[PDB]
Design a protein around this ligand. Sequence first.
Ligand SMILES: Nc1nc2c(ncn2[C@@H]2O[C@@H]3COP(=O)(O)O[C@H]4[C@@H](O)[C@H](n5cnc6c(=O)[nH]c(N)nc65)O[C@@H]4COP(=O)(O)O[C@H]3[C@H]2O)c(=O)[nH]1
Ligand SMILES: Nc1nc2c(ncn2[C@@H]2O[C@@H]3COP(=O)(O)O[C@H]4[C@@H](O)[C@H](n5cnc6c(=O)[nH]c(N)nc65)O[C@@H]4COP(=O)(O)O[C@H]3[C@H]2O)c(=O)[nH]1
Lengths: 548, 548
Amino acid sequence: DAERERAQITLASIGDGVITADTQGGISYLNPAAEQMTNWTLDKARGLPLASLFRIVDLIEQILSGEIDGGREHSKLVLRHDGSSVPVTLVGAPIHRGAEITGVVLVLHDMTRERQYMARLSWQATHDALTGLTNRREFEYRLQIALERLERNSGRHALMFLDLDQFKLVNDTCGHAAGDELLRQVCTLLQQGLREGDTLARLGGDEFGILLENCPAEKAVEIADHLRKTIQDLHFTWSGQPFNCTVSVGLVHLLPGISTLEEALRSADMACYMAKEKGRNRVQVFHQDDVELSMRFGEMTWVQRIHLALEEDRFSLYAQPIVPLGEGAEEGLHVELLLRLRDEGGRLVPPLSFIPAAERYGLMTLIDRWVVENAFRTLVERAQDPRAEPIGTCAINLSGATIGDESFLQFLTELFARYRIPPQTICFEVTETVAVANLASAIRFINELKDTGCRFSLDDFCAGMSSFIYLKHLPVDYLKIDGSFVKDMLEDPIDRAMVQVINHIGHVMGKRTIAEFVETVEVMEALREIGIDYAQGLAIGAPLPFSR
Amino acid sequence: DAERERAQITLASIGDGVITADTQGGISYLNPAAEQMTNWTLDKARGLPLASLFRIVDLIEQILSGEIDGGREHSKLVLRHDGSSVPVTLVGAPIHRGAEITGVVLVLHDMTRERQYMARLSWQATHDALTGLTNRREFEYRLQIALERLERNSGRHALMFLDLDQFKLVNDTCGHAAGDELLRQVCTLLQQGLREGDTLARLGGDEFGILLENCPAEKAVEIADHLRKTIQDLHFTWSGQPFNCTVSVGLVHLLPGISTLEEALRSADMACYMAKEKGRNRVQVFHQDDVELSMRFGEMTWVQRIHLALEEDRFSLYAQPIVPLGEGAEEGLHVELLLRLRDEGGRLVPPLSFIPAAERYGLMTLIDRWVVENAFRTLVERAQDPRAEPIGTCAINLSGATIGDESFLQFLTELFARYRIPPQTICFEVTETVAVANLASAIRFINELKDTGCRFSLDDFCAGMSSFIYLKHLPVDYLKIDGSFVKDMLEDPIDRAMVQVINHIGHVMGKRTIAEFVETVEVMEALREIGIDYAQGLAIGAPLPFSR
Ligand SMILES: Nc1nc2c(ncn2[C@@H]2O[C@@H]3COP(=O)(O)O[C@H]4[C@@H](O)[C@H](n5cnc6c(=O)[nH]c(N)nc65)O[C@@H]4COP(=O)(O)O[C@H]3[C@H]2O)c(=O)[nH]1
Ligand SMILES: Nc1nc2c(ncn2[C@@H]2O[C@@H]3COP(=O)(O)O[C@H]4[C@@H](O)[C@H](n5cnc6c(=O)[nH]c(N)nc65)O[C@@H]4COP(=O)(O)O[C@H]3[C@H]2O)c(=O)[nH]1
């Protein structure tokens, strides 16, 4: 029928190569994109076998009907038979007649064409890949325009920082794929509650940004409380299991002309942190003098609380083993160090409660200098026993405060002299986020320490081009695959490939990989099969006391 | 007919949303990917108008048949009418019956899905986007494996660095799109001449890398000379105009176990530079003592040549104006400074001949200290005339040598005191490549200088995610759109969009843009329309003498 013309136009409109072949070989259809890719017109290629023209290699034109893919892209090369290869990502599917497998269809994507997609490159640079909302790049730009513009600048604006109180919980509990959905659902929820001419963004992690251009002070708080209540009223469930979904809002009434971008962002960040300190699931409006004193007070509260904890010897160190998945691998003992604080009452405080508050008020350099010294102090005390299990590696986490700290190296040279621990045994751990936050400083730090004999590790690493662009400049020795991927790796196929990608690129960049959150032997065997170097988790070993 | 089942399966296999509608509105077809995207089954959406269901916005379902796109993707949003937007890149095409425009077809791509493509992310990180060959990441990794491996390491390997002698010429003359084709053609040409188990890469720019694992010394040179002759025998033509296409090969006979990656790459780079110094279109085999003395000799030759040129006052400075495209924009005079050397004979030497040789032997810090001092010296001499055209901006190019040079700031503080030129007037210029080469150092440099009052500019900038990732960390004030894009912008549609992308993202990152190589008023008007801030080129003003 002439309905073929409609179908032919549709397939011609599509950018990807479309090859339709018979169950044995012979070509049925070729869209112009496939005709171009294969160097063969359908006029002169119809009925001729696929393999006896060009070649799809790394024979293959049978596993589609048998057992392979079913949606997952696979890297292949179209050997033209004259003008060499065309790099493609294949998608195969069997052509049926109910049960009768009559042929096979292939969806080929030219990896060379990627470079040409401009409207897509322009989008990604102005939007978050996951949510589809504007990113910090575009958001700060939009905020700056709102603060300097001459036209449409009659009223006052409103800036909100909305932190999803349960994002880490969902993500760590259910896996990366779950927390991505929670963010994907919270996005549309805020999107529903926002008028036209309003900027909604994801400024990273669990944080979202709202810009309310030309909005009165009352309306601005009324809108905030509503979005806060609607996230609270949102019932989030992952594989039937429900989550107590809620958000911490920080509001800033902005003024165009007199207020600045740095002040605007720093003010919304103070007020947001305040809603969290004031118990989470709260809106907090910024005020320059009053309810700003709360930060001045909080500084003194935490200076005293952290210092008291150091003099009262309330901090203790725990050790969690990291083991090689390598076949018959010996090596020394490898452990990561985990900090534990015991409150005045005598209860173990998890790092959730004090580390962010000690990060905010700038007391982390202290905690790091305390941790490193006690890790060396404990290593000497352990060394006293001849029969004791020798430690080949000892991973210690460093804050952005320490990376910025110019006096740290001297302190470490002083620690190495005093305790005589070999540098090689030590492996400092910095998170990909912390490194990118102060990029120049992380590089300069990493190199100064690597030259001392120490080792480096890039904790909580998530694959993407940016991360692999950053990884080029960070001379780390190891890569800690973010546990959220390792959690539901055997459940969601995207996270299994996300682990698979970190491993290959990690190895290509000459880095040994570590999988975090390896809770089950089944997970461990999955990672061993993939070729992950080390496993850390509950199936390996739980944190046990290191210090006294 | 039942051929609909074949077509339905094909459209279901495709990842992108496919909406087929009537000339007025009503829906004809929806693939499951479009059904998912639009929140409507074809069972319950057939015949109902497109606009009276969901909405494609920033009405639109008519310009496809009229006049718009014809292949170019356009950013749009599918407003679900219940669960807000889905970010997409649209491709429209009219459905015909010869002349009878019966309907319309739309190809929608979910920008959220981009994040999920893993096989594609893994590829891009191990391959060059343009050529499709392995990148430096993968190539160095493959080389390292070849130097340490226990299995398949009986023989000796061969490393080649093949520099395309005319790549800059084609690119500058014809435009970016031409030099990309030349590289695309040279790729398949080397690909044709390479056996199975051989690594062919593009280690950037005009440079390609060849790894010949387990190959005898004779065969290795025989293969080199052949690939050299076949590139020479390649007839390259752009829009009918032919180019004298040829390559400079540098060969290194590698040994697995005793030889190292750093040595391997540095040796192939020395021998390659040598084929260029020995007149280009040559293969050059590396030898540790003999024909290595040529580098020791070349150091002395250029130490003498550059120093002689400084004491003989043979170097002179030229000024090229950069003008704003801004409507009724005044400002001071903006100029870029260009270095000119006059050889012993009295002939103007173009920077092509001495800058790479003075970069290699490390004499650039010298030339930069000479340039900056004479730019300030000339500015004072110009200032002596009251009626003289005042200079508001003066752009000066800095080498990676100067960026690495810790004593430069002191030198500049010394120059500012001595000549009394205000820092604000000065705009130092560093190329995106030079910055990324020593990333930590460029950031630390840029910031130290920006704090002095100076300005910064990122010369020869090419849009891509990596460049926009780097641009985040480089606090430059301006962006010099690579002239190769500006050259054939009104000819190839990809380069017009490549200019368009740099401008928008550049402005989003709060940077003023400059277009290089603005040869015609027509080009200038094109860039003005796009919203480019400044234009530099022959239509604006040619380089005239600045110094004496
Ligand atoms: N669900 C699950 N969890 C597992 C499993 N195995 C280990 N874990 C948990 O994973 C965390 C490992 O630490 P991290 O991700 O590097 O993340 C660290 C690090 O970000 C920070 N931290 C801890 N100590 C220090 C320190 O001394 N200095 C600095 N700067 N940060 C520290 O706090 C976090 C440690 O908190 P912990 O409560 O010790 O949390 C530990 C541990 O309780 C598992 O199989 N399943
Ligand atoms: N086809 C075409 N070309 C145009 C047009 N307008 C200007 N040009 C050319 O574009 C070049 C501009 O310099 P650049 O791209 O920054 O690139 C610079 C820079 O990379 C380098 N350079 C020059 N002076 C210095 C210097 O003093 N120090 C350092 N480190 N590098 C320098 O050498 C290059 C300058 O070489 P020049 O021969 O002066 O080349 C000049 C100029 O001749 C046009 O409309 N059409």
